[PDB]
Ligand binder design. Sequence first.
Ligand SMILES: Cc1cc2c(cc1C)N1[C@H](O)C[C@H](c3c(F)c(F)c(F)c(F)c3F)[C@]13C(=O)NC(=O)N=C3N2C[C@H](O)[C@H](O)[C@H](O)COP(=O)(O)OP(=O)(O)OC[C@H]1O[C@@H](n2cnc3c(N)ncnc32)[C@H](O)[C@@H]1O
Length: 643
Amino acid sequence: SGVEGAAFQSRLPHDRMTSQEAACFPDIISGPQQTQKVFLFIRNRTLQLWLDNPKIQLTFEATLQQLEAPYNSDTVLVHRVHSYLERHGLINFGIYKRIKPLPTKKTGKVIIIGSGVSGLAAARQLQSFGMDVTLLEARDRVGGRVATFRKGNYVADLGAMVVTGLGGNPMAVVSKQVNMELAKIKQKCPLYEANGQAVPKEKDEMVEQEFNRLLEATSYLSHQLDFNVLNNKPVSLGQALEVVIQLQEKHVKDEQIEHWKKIVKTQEELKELLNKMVNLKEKIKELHQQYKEDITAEFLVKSKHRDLTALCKEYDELAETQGKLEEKLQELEANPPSDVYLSSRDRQILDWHFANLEFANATPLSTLSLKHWDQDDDFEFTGSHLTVRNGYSCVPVALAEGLDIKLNTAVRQVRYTASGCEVIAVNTRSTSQTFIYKCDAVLCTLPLGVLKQQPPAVQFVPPLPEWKTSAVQRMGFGNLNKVVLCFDRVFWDPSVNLFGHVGSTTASRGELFLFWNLYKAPILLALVAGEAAGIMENISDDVIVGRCLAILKGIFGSSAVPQPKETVVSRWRADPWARGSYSYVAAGSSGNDYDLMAQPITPPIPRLFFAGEHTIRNYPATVHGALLSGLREAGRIADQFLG
Ligand SMILES: Cc1cc2c(cc1C)N1[C@H](O)C[C@H](c3c(F)c(F)c(F)c(F)c3F)[C@]13C(=O)NC(=O)N=C3N2C[C@H](O)[C@H](O)[C@H](O)COP(=O)(O)OP(=O)(O)OC[C@H]1O[C@@H](n2cnc3c(N)ncnc32)[C@H](O)[C@@H]1O
């Protein structure tokens, strides 16, 4: 599966054209299948070549000279394919040598708002497409939601930090380009309760098993019984979970009842049995006496005998059918069903798994769309998740190489007319001096959090379409902060990549719930998800770092946890250039909104385009998702202006 592998790594089916490829190649799709059979191969072969060496640019003639007979003969077809793959970022993207110099004459002027991974991606494309591009960044750096703390030998990511499986992941290519040092995450994750004592492997799995069961349940109700709407309002994942758990609690009490009923019943049957026994116990005194009292005694005590014995053939007899009761009685009162669904402690551990989810989605479960929260699930990449051992910032930096980025430039208004665009921005360091950049098209990679901001951070003239603003408002933009604790000593298990901390209450189940051991230097990361994420931003670094040490000193014991010589704390929600961590499908929305976002705004011809982790439906809230959305718009614009 050589050429079959390339197709896969590019999120493409090696044995069939996609709806898009069919749109650009109608002649092929609607023609001899033998031809379509050829198209694919060339496509899969071109990709193969590019992936087997993403360091250097794969030119048209470079591809045409590496194909074999008879493919290399159909030059025209090869070109159409090669060109296509290049125009849509499937080849020659990221950072690579340009064996063919860029045209001295840049055709088309486009302004890109934001120097994030999505912005830098599209930027390098449009530029390589021989087009004058300019990026306006508000921050004094690049990467946007990709930040990395670097001081001495210390390295830590305050933003992105994980690479979700290399299989099919575009970052796999970029990684190979920027020499990004990655490392798998050892699944071994020990949980420590409030006091500080670990959780026995038994429960750790007992609870986690239920966690999966409850989720599966919610999935059932949602995608099988269609329980996505209640009281005319959308149902949230958390909402559903609370209900499912509310049922398990019921069932538990139900069995507890039937059991108490069996008990009471057996007890009733006993008290009753003992009663007549005492009546027969008395019926014996009537015969064990009165005897030896009739000259025909030879037949008197003779008959009476089988009468007193017959009554004993009952008493000690009932003891038999009475024995089969003490057994059942003691047997039941010794095998009582689960007193409760989850103990006060069981719930605490389960909250860790929910908090762990509130971390993944970067928002409280009660705000997630029970039906669409996991809409992009069918697009995950195969392979183990990785961590950027050397700071995830090494990527956006390499991408900004050779680009015209103007840091310290906050865009405050975007003007798009039937012909031409104007992007008015101001210098952050000196809000007095403003700037006015003219262009043909504008690419807005602004975070959903900024677009939602009220009052608006940037002004759109004419005002953004109604179908757009509404989508922006319906979508959800989560939050998630970290606390980088820099030490000069590793007092924790060096083998364990991450360990968790269980909270005391459901409310604060996301407060420093997970610690990370990823970087070389003695550094740990504390995550604050869910409710805590936003709240914790109102607490000074001092107190925050304080609470952390406490947690640590409770796990590793005090006197073993030294004072951090360097500490970093994020507040993406407070960050004026972010206003949150990343998007998420909120109850009352869907992946459909992730397309309305991508939809360009047009007055007779598309002028304003959008990109970002909130515009790519199948790969939302991710570095690669943002990357792909970048390459996406890159081509979209290229067609609109270069054709
Ligand atoms: C916020 C955040 C986001 C992420 C994150 C952590 C945080 C705190 N890390 C976490 O480690 C776990 C997720 C994680 C996960 F999410 C998952 F889904 C998952 F499955 C996991 F397993 C994870 F581990 C993860 C990760 O580990 N792995 C991931 O793949 N993604 C992660 N994310 C999300 C990504 O950071 C995010 O998708 C990406 O950064 C998006 O990039 P972008 O689209 O270019 O957006 P941008 O903000 O970078 O760029 C906008 C630019 O515009 C500028 N700007 C602003 N305002 C103005 C003006 N007014 N004028 C001019 N300019 C301007 C801004 O300043 C920028 O320069």
